[PDB]
Design a binder for this molecule. Structure first.
Ligand SMILES: [Cl-]
Ligand code: NA
Length: 103
């Protein structure tokens, strides 16, 4: 499932997790305030920690390419949650006029 930025906001308001799968350097330069960072490589090595698990998990990346290309991996990493992918990543979030945090 892909989810629009405005629809993701709605889910986050009901406690859904938003997971940034980018690297810490990317995150530090610009991120979504409500997102929790967990780079894909780390998730692949040691899985999703309990603190980031929820009924509803939304992954995001830069532009939607990384989540689309790693959809099966993300689906198992977050199982058995209801899992979504942020349409066009943070770039999508920006295009929808939602706030970001720039260093
Ligand atoms: Cl991307
Ligand atoms: Na995404």
């Amino acid at each position: 499932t892909t989810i629009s930025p405005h629809d993701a906001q709605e889910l986050i308001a009901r406690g859904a997790k938003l997971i940034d799968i980018r690297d810490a350097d990317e995150y530090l330069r610009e991120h979504i305030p409500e997102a929790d960072l967990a780079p894909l490589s780390v998730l692949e090595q040691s899985g999703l920690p309990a603190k980031l698990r929820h009924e509803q998990i939304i992954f995001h990346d830069q532009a939607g390419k990384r989540t689309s290309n790693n959809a099966d991996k993300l689906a198992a990493i977050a199982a058995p949650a209801e899992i979504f992918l942020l349409e066009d990543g943070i770039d999508g979030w920006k295009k929808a006029g939602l706030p970001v945090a720039v260093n």
